[PDB]
Amino acid sequence: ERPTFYRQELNKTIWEVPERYQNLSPVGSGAYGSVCAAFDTKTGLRVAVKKLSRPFQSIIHAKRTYRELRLLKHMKHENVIGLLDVFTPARSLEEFNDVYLVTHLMGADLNNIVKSQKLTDDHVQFLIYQILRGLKYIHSADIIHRDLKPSNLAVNEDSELKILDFGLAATRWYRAPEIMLNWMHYNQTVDIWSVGCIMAELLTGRTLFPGTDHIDQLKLILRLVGTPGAELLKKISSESARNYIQSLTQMPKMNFANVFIGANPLAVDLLEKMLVLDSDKRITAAQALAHAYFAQYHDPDDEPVADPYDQSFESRDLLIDEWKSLTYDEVISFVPPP
Ligand SMILES: CCc1nc(-c2cccc(C)c2)c(-c2ccnc(NC(=O)c3ccccc3)c2)s1
Numbered sequence: 567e568r569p570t571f572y573r574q575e576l577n578k579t580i581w582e583v584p585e586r587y588q589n590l591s592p593v594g595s596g597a598y599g600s601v602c603a604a605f606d607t608k609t610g611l612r613v614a615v616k617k618l619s620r621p622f623q624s625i626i627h628a629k630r631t632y633r634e635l636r637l638l639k640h641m642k643h644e645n646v647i648g649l650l651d652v653f654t655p656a657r658s659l660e661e662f663n664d665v666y667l668v669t670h671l672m673g674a675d676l677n678n679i680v681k682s683q684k685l686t687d688d689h690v691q692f693l694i695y696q697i698l699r700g701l702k703y704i705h706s707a708d709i710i711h712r713d714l715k716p717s718n719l720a721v722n723e724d725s726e727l728k729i730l731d732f733g734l735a736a737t738r739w740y741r742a743p744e745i746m747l748n749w750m751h752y753n754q755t756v757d758i759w760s761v762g763c764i765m766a767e768l769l770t771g772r773t774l775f776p777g778t779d780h781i782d783q784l785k786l787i788l789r790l791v792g793t794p795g796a797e798l799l800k801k802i803s804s805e806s807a808r809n810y811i812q813s814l815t816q817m818p819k820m821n822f823a824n825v826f827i828g829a830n831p832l833a834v835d836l837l838e839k840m841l842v843l844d845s846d847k848r849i850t851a852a853q854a855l856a857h858a859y860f861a862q863y864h865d866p867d868d869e870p871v872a873d874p875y876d877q878s879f880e881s882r883d884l885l886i887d888e889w890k891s892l893t894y895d896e897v898i899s900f901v902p903p904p
Pocket residue numbers: 593594598601603614615616638647648649667668669670671672673674732733734735
């Protein structure tokens with residue numbers, strides 16, 4: 567049942583992959599490992615193959631490898647990066663040292679389709695719809711992305727979009743204010759804040775909150791969404807955090823209609839619901855998909871949710887060989903998608 571593997575050196579690393587993956591071509595590398603483009607002769611698909619670096623070097627590396635693999639195996643949605651294949655040239659656990667991950671080759675992210683231009687309202691609808699459809703699924707697995715930005719959104723020529731965690735082979739511009747401040751209780755709508763920032767930028771052709779630094783970022787945010795009202799302040803536990811809010815100059819929320827000039831009034835309404843300062847009042851991914859702005863794309867019967875995602879491993883402190891063994895189990899149990 568094991569396919570025939572072949573060796574090949576690139577960039578200065580011995581790749582050992584099953585024969586089905588042909589014409590390996592390095593696309594990039596980093597501290598995580600290396601990625602090659604390949605042709606999958608089994609499927610006729612152009613795939614990316616990633617060889618992890620130092621997957622089991624330490625307890626932390628091993629747990630990270632297991633984390634990454636477990637998550638990828640669980641993410642099964644059109645708008646979220648998933649797994650076509652996972653393999654190892656190892657024939658046993660004792661042999662097991664390398665992990666390779668396989669996914670659809672992606673050639674572009676949101677930045678390089680947009681090219682910092684105004685997109686049409688129809689195009690924005692389609693892109694934002696997809697992000698939110700992916701987010702609904704992600705959030706239903708009780709996961710928060712936390713790092714949504716244009717570089718974490720892969721987009722093909724047909725503007726079909728997938729959410730990434732790591733980009734292709736600043737961030738503060740899309741971060742929710744509660745993360746910018748050190749408010750130690752955030753919800754999934756931190757990702758909705760990010761989506762609103764992305765949406766605004768797609769519509770306007772300009773970064774919504776291009777802060778120069780941490781402080782500037784919050785200044786820019788608060789100028790638009792206002793300083794915390796009395797309802798929000800009542801939910802802030804630390805005196806000094808409230809002291810920090812009050813010390814800074816008090817400004818009203820701007821009317822987004824007087825900000826996003828010429829935009830579809832439904833786009834403006836949705837942005838208002840995404841960019842509420844109080845995260846308790848921020849629209850969810852599922853509620854946003856039902857918003858009238860998405861009427862041409864919304865299908866309540868094809869916006870699926872994820873299976874329950876068991877994240878209990880996160881609280882465990884195990885030895886390297888235990889994490890390695892658990893990862894090995896996940897490699898061998900992988901069933902390709904249909
Ligand atoms: C930075 C860490 C990365 N990991 C992957 C990856 C590869 C295989 C499997 C999985 C789960 C992730 C990446 C990936 C996935 C799919 N496509 C790409 N493609 C590219 O990076 C790319 C860039 C320019 C031109 C052509 C291709 C990268 S990037």
